[model samples]
Target: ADMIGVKELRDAFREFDTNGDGEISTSELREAMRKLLGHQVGHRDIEEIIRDVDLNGDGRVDFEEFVRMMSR
Candidate 1:
């Protein structure tokens, strides 16, 4: 379970990136984390942007039904 791979695994990513601060809020995402990863999510888990690359000028990101996953 990696950043790029996470896009297709669940929808929580869309709302996770909802904040303009470029970070995910804990509530819903943590729930998704538990369901998807089978682990309790903490603030320590959501401290970074869940993306494959850097330097985004899109202002916002929309993950649809499909996205490329980089092997980790």
Candidate 2:
């Protein structure tokens, strides 16, 4: 798959950071997935997704981490 550009990734990160906190928490991730997939994303699903890319072990996804995950 083609990689997303930096601008595109930044925009997506901004959107995903729903609380405007400059990071995506589990709630934000869940909301993003729910909106995109049109269904409820369970707690475990949200955790798994965050765990996959939460490189810092901080339990949140920063823009850099999110970009890395999406870029892959």
| Candidate 2 lDDT by residue in tens digits, 2-70 | 576677888888888766797888788878887888655367977787888756878778888887888
Model 1: CA > 4 A from native: 1-26, 38-41, 49-61, 64-72
**Candidate 2 RMSD computed on C-alpha atoms after optimal superposition onto the true structure:** 4.3
Write down the lDDT that model 2 would get.
Answer: 0.79
Per-residue lDDT for 1-72 in model 1, tens only?
Answer: 467656544454454554544333344445435566775445554423333223254322234311322223
Alpha-carbon shift of residue 67 in model 1 (angstroms): 2.4
Q: Give candidate 2 misplaced runs (Cα > 4 Å).
A: 1-4
lDDT (Cα atoms) of all candidates against the true structure: 0.41, 0.79
Which candidate number maximizes TM-score?
2
TM-score of decoy 1: 0.30
| Root-mean-square deviation (CA) per prediction | 8.6, 4.3
